[PDB]
Design an enzyme around this catalytic site. Structure first.
Site, PDB file in Angstrom:
ATOM      1  N   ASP A 210       3.476  -0.373   4.322  1.00  0.00           N
ATOM      2  CA  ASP A 210       3.295   1.071   4.175  1.00  0.00           C
ATOM      3  C   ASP A 210       4.596   1.766   4.535  1.00  0.00           C
ATOM      4  O   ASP A 210       5.539   1.146   5.034  1.00  0.00           O
ATOM      5  CB  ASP A 210       2.140   1.619   5.032  1.00  0.00           C
ATOM      6  CG  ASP A 210       0.777   1.505   4.335  1.00  0.00           C
ATOM      7  OD1 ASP A 210       0.626   2.065   3.239  1.00  0.00           O
ATOM      8  OD2 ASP A 210      -0.131   0.822   4.861  1.00  0.00           O
TER       9      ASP A 210
ATOM     10  N   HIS B 294       0.827  -1.192   0.000  1.00  0.00           N
ATOM     11  CA  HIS B 294       0.000   0.000   0.000  1.00  0.00           C
ATOM     12  C   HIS B 294       0.872   1.257   0.000  1.00  0.00           C
ATOM     13  O   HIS B 294       0.333   2.364  -0.129  1.00  0.00           O
ATOM     14  CB  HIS B 294      -0.936  -0.037   1.230  1.00  0.00           C
ATOM     15  CG  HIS B 294      -1.955   1.062   1.320  1.00  0.00           C
ATOM     16  ND1 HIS B 294      -1.766   2.186   2.099  1.00  0.00           N
ATOM     17  CD2 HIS B 294      -3.216   1.153   0.837  1.00  0.00           C
ATOM     18  CE1 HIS B 294      -2.844   2.951   2.041  1.00  0.00           C
ATOM     19  NE2 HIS B 294      -3.744   2.346   1.289  1.00  0.00           N
TER      20      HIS B 294
ATOM     21  N   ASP C 103      -5.740  15.269  -0.522  1.00  0.00           N
ATOM     22  CA  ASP C 103      -4.662  14.320  -0.272  1.00  0.00           C
ATOM     23  C   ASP C 103      -3.367  15.104  -0.121  1.00  0.00           C
ATOM     24  O   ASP C 103      -3.324  16.325  -0.369  1.00  0.00           O
ATOM     25  CB  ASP C 103      -4.544  13.313  -1.409  1.00  0.00           C
ATOM     26  CG  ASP C 103      -4.169  11.923  -0.926  1.00  0.00           C
ATOM     27  OD1 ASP C 103      -3.472  11.799   0.118  1.00  0.00           O
ATOM     28  OD2 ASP C 103      -4.582  10.945  -1.589  1.00  0.00           O
TER      29      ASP C 103
ATOM     30  N   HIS D 235      -8.189  11.717   1.864  1.00  0.00           N
ATOM     31  CA  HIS D 235      -7.397  10.503   1.968  1.00  0.00           C
ATOM     32  C   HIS D 235      -6.059  10.718   2.675  1.00  0.00           C
ATOM     33  O   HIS D 235      -5.196   9.840   2.589  1.00  0.00           O
ATOM     34  CB  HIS D 235      -7.100   9.934   0.575  1.00  0.00           C
ATOM     35  CG  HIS D 235      -8.273   9.288  -0.091  1.00  0.00           C
ATOM     36  ND1 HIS D 235      -8.276   8.949  -1.429  1.00  0.00           N
ATOM     37  CD2 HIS D 235      -9.487   8.936   0.391  1.00  0.00           C
ATOM     38  CE1 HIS D 235      -9.439   8.403  -1.736  1.00  0.00           C
ATOM     39  NE2 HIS D 235     -10.191   8.383  -0.649  1.00  0.00           N
TER      40      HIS D 235
END
EC number: 3.1.4.4
Length: 480
Positions: free
Chosen positions: A440, A168, A200, A415
């Protein structure tokens, strides 16, 4: 005695060496000598916030999106050795693909031969939008003759089906020297071709911390190449007769890295489930991987890092996220230690702001009820918990204008994976605060000058418009 100028990083570092000492260098790393990669026209444009509108429900000003695409193209176009990309599936498309192609053509036109890795994580069900040999061929066709100069690796990977783990992270590293990372996965996913774009944020930097990101990608690619013959775990495609470049970064870029600026940073990631089971060097001694798996913590230092950043706050904390709670059984609903850390801070009088995305895209009642329940454990009663919460919490859903929705009728969505404390130290990356067991990565930056730019350019406007949705706001006596 001398006074540290990096008290927040010092605390986070101390926690990471306790939790994941053997992963230092590869999955987390503290470096000095970084530069937030903002031009001289605009000193703040290291802060790649998309779309960039504020006060405008028609989002006229799209300079944030335009600046992101130009920076991707410029950074790749300056590549002389390596280009290293990770994202969530699907493979790059649309405007991101155009920027990749234009940058690679520009590098090739300057006489360079490049090694390029592109790695995506796939949910075990999404295996249509993930054909790597198709993507390799389409990118090679769009490159034209410039493809002659490119050694390419393209892969889709899933590290655990049972524990829902896959990449991700969203990273662009060039020559192991420049890096972009953050929450932006693609143009379409953030609805950026649209009049209801998703808010974002990414950051761009140069210096040693870009090497840290390369070493993180080497860790994922070493596993990917080890598993390239397991069709259930990896689908891999390469140009010509190229091999699987497990350690492109170690090989092609060096460890000692010159300073480009004066910003200290902790790079921190996690390996999710199925890459490494445990950090064998760790003596940390604190199915639910978020809340009840010591070994999982030791290979996912980012979780401990984010809780430590909260714990380091002396004055105030701002959290901006898609959500704090997960709605993905078998995942737990929330990170207990995170909520307990936030409760202890409010119990001390440290201010906490949480802005999440509109549930349409209460969501808010779930958060305040949980914080209150964790505060009740600490303070002894619901009445004392309410006192600590109402006096110290701001809780709202996100808005980027005085309108309750975009001009076109769709709700605002956001996000971000953003945390800031004491207008000093902040995280920008791909790791959500809600429970998730993915690979991540992100950066924790201690720089009051940069944190104040983040206030002025993002968190101040965010709150100017989001406060209108607040169910709790100590600054106006709201506590519903």
């Amino acid at each position: 005695s001398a006074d540290s100028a990096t008290p927040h990083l010092d605390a986070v570092e101390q926690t990471l060496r306790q939790v994941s000492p053997g992963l230092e260098g590869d999955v987390w790393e503290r470096t000095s000598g970084n530069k937030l990669d903002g031009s001289a026209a605009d000193p703040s444009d290291w802060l790649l916030q998309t779309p960039g509108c504020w006060g405008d429900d028609r989002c006229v000003d799209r300079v944030g999106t335009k600046r992101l695409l130009a920076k991707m193209t410029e950074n790749i176009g300056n590549a002389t050795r390596t280009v290293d990309i990770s994202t969530l599936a699907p493979f790059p498309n649309g405007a991101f693909q155009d920027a990749i192609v234009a940058g690679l053509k520009e590098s090739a036109a300057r006489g360079n031969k490049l090694k390029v890795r592109i790695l995506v994580g796939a949910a075990p069900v999404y295996h249509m939008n993930v054909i790597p040999s198709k993507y390799r061929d389409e990118l090679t066709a769009k490159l034209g003759k410039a493809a002659e100069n490119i050694t390419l690796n393209v892969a889709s990977m899933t590290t655990s089906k049972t524990a829902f783990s896959w990449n991700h992270s969203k990273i662009l590293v060039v020559d192991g020297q420049s890096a972009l990372t953050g929450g932006i996965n693609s143009w379409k996913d953030d609805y950026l071709d649209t009049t209801h774009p998703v808010s974002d944020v990414d950051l761009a930097l140069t210096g040693p911390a870009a090497g840290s990101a390369g070493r993180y990608l080497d860790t994922l690619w070493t596993w990917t190449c080890q598993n390239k013959s397991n069709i259930a775990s990896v689908w891999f495609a390469a140009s010509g007769n190229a091999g699987c470049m497990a350690t492109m970064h170690k090989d092609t870029n060096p460890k000692a890295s010159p300073a480009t600026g004066n910003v200290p940073i902790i790079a921190v990631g996690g390996l999710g489930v199925g890459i490494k089971d445990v950090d064998p060097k760790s003596t940390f001694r604190p199915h639910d991987n978020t809340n009840a798996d010591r070994d999982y913590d030791t290979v996912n230092p980012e979780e401990s890092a984010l809780r430590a950043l909260v714990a380091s706050a002396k004055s105030h904390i701002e959290i901006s996220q898609q959500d704090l709670n997960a709605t993905c059984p078998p995942l737990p609903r929330y990170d207990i230690r995170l909520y307990d850390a936030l409760a202890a801070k409010m119990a001390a009088g440290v201010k906490v702001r949480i802005v999440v995305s509109d549930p349409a895209n209460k969501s808010l009642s779930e958060i305040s009820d949980t914080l209150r329940n964790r505060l009740a454990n600490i303070t002894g009663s619901q009445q004392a918990a309410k006192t600590a919460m109402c006096s110290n919490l701001q809780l709202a859903t996100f808005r980027s204008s005085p309108n309750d929705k975009w001009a076109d009728g769709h709700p605002y969505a956001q996000h971000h994976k953003l945390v800031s404390v004491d207008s000093s130290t902040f995280y920008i990356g791909s790791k959500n605060l809600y429970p998730s067991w993915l690979q991540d990565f992100g950066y924790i930056v201690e720089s009051p000058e940069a944190a104040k730019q983040l206030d002025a350019k993002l968190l101040d406007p965010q709150w100017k418009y989001s406060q209108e949705t607040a169910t709790v706001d100590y600054a106006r006596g709201i506590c519903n």
